Design a protein around this ligand. Structure first.
Ligand code: HEM
Length: 153
């Protein structure tokens, strides 16, 4: 459970993300693919991009960045009350895309990295802890829904 204080720290940082959603989303996916290259194998649509500069130049990767942050932003704004938002995401990521929880840990690490890179003044230890707690709650709840669908990834 996040406190009101922790949610405010999360949603203040998120408001900065929403000022350049496409830039943040693209940088998060590129960070993911750079830090954990195996993750790129899950994306038939992007696995032809070979350099960081090619990924940065990809309008289609950037649009997927917007998808991912729009979905996560809607979940974070529910402050834990996100059953309805997780349902479709759990169904696709468990049974179609087959995304293990360790890859949701990797993308969580990429989110923390990009938000600290872009907002070092306003993303110190307490805001990082609160964002980590929010992403931990997301991963815990989606893992529970994964298992309800029979997926042990
Ligand atoms: C914060 C975490 C994530 C959020 C909010 C998220 C959200 C989304 C959304 C909204 C879609 C489009 C609708 C859908 O199919 O459900 C999507 C598609 C997809 N996601 Fe995720 N995603 C997450 C993490 C990941 C990770 C870590 C991987 C792989 C390592 C992944 C791989 C997939 C793939 C393969 C698609 C289909 C992409 C395509 O259009 O070709 N996702 N994701």
């Amino acid at each position: 459970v996040l406190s009101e204080k922790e949610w405010k720290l999360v949603l203040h940082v998120w408001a900065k993300v929403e000022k350049d959603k496409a830039g943040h989303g693209q940088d998060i996916l590129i960070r993911l693919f750079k830090s954990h290259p195996e993750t790129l194998e899950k994306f038939d649509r992007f696995k032809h991009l070979k350099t960081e500069a090619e990924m940065k130049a990809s309008e289609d990767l950037k649009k997927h960045g917007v998808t991912v942050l729009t979905a996560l932003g809607a979940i974070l704004k529910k402050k834990g009350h996100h059953e309805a938002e997780l349902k479709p995401l759990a169904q696709s990521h468990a049974t179609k895309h087959k995304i293990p929880i360790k890859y949701l840990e990797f993308i969580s690490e990429a989110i923390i990295h990009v938000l600290h890179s872009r907002h070092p003044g306003d993303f110190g230890a307490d805001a990082q802890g609160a964002m980590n707690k929010a992403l931990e709650l997301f991963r815990k709840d989606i893992a529970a829904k994964y298992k309800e669908l029979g997926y042990q990834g």
